[PDB]
């Protein structure tokens, strides 16, 4: 029970930080009126 709770908290927190970093990557690039995404930050953050 405690190992499943530790693993659950760790996976949920890592997924939360991943979504936080994806938002932090794509927030400056979407507010621009040109609406383009560069080559590296498109595929690595699933931006399309």
């Amino acid at each position: 029970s405690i190992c499943a709770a530790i693993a659950t908290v760790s996976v949920a927190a890592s997924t939360w930080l991943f979504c936080r970093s994806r938002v932090a990557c794509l927030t400056p690039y979407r507010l621009t009126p040109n609406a383009r995404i560069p080559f590296c930050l498109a595929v690595l953050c699933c931006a399309r």
Partner: protein, 163 residues
Amino acid sequence: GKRQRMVMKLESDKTFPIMLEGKINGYACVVGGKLFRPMHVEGKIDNDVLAALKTKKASKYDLEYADVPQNMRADTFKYTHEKPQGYYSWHHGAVQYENGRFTVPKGVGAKGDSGRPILDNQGRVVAIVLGGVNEGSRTALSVVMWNEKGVTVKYTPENCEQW
């Protein structure tokens, strides 16, 4: 004199106010097929087309953005990233761009004039006014702008008051 008339001629149809029980508290911006609108200004869009949409949020940059349809993308503002230092046109006259900072002389500035874009001598939007802070005699602006790379940079001085 004629600068305010040019601002009223350029921002006539493209600028829509935000109503809140009859009070004008902010102004949206239609540029690049995008509808910029701040967080702290809350109310209904005076335009009927722009009100029936869904705006994606960005609380860190302080911007809500949406997708303007294709039948209105030609009637938008212009935008650019190439800006020198000096003078620019604003709705209440002139604004100085010094050391990468927008400064407005005092006397003007209250609650309600948030979202007015900053124009140049050609007719392109270089910044969007979001807030202001009183600095001695000459106030500074907390705005957003772009760059050559394509990253929306939000400039915010110390202890600003939201308008």
